[PDB]
Amino acid sequence: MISLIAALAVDRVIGMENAMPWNLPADLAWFKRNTLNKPVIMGRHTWESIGRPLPGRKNIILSSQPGTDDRVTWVKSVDEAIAACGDVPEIMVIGGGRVYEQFLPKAQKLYLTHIDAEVEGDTHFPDYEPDDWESVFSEFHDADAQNSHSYCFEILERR
Ligand SMILES: NC(=O)C1=CN([C@@H]2O[C@H](COP(=O)(O)OP(=O)(O)OC[C@H]3O[C@@H](n4cnc5c(N)ncnc54)[C@H](OP(=O)(O)O)[C@@H]3O)[C@@H](O)[C@H]2O)C=CC1
Numbered sequence: 001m002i003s004l005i006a007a008l009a010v011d012r013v014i015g016m017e018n019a020m021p022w023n024l025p026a027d028l029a030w031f032k033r034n035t036l037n038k039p040v041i042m043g044r045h046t047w048e049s050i051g052r053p054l055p056g057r058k059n060i061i062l063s064s065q066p067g068t069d070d071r072v073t074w075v076k077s078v079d080e081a082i083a084a085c086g087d088v089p090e091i092m093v094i095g096g097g098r099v100y101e102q103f104l105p106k107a108q109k110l111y112l113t114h115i116d117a118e119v120e121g122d123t124h125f126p127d128y129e130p131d132d133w134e135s136v137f138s139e140f141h142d143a144d145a146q147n148s149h150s151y152c153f154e155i156l157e158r159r
Pocket residue numbers: 005006007008013014015016017018019020042043044045046047049062063064065075076077078094095096097098099100102123
């Protein structure tokens with residue numbers, strides 16, 4: 001199965017200037033929890049933001065150009081990215097916006113972090129029909145000294 005995992009501020013904002021307009025270590029800990037020991041597919045801009053291989057995950061980077069880090073797997077198309085995951089129970093697609101657009105129609109599950117931040121984005125999560133998805137999990141958290149916004153984890157499954 002293919003899953004997307006993403007963090008969305010108000011109005012579907014996911015990015016601005018190749019960064020995220022928030023700083024939420026709790027969301028990174030949820031991201032780690034839900035991606036560990038699964039292959040992760042990401043776009044080249046996202047890979048450059050991360051800056052190193054994510055431990056405990058096969059890291060698969062989409063780019064039309066030859067790879068520039070021998071520690072990770074580079075692929076030139078959506079089908080090659082999926083093939084590189086081999087036979088696993090769950091492939092995780094971790095961004096950015098261009099990659100989410102391509103994989104959303106193939107996905108059966110969404111792991112969303114809804115961040116209560118009103119911030120400008122240049123990159124937005126794709127729209128999709130809410131009736132197509134069933135919410136199966138929610139977990140609310142208030143802001144705290146390390147996470148300046150409240151946020152709510154949610155998992156949805158395609159109906
Ligand atoms: N809030 C969140 O959950 C997340 C937010 N983000 C944010 O998203 C933004 C980045 O998104 P975006 O700019 O869309 O970039 P992406 O990270 O999606 O990377 C885009 C690049 O990936 C490569 N690529 C994508 N699809 C294909 C394909 N089918 N075949 C070949 N190469 C492909 C291309 O690289 P090349 O140019 O080398 O061909 C393309 O330029 C940033 O603001 C980042 O912070 C990122 C991850 C998670």
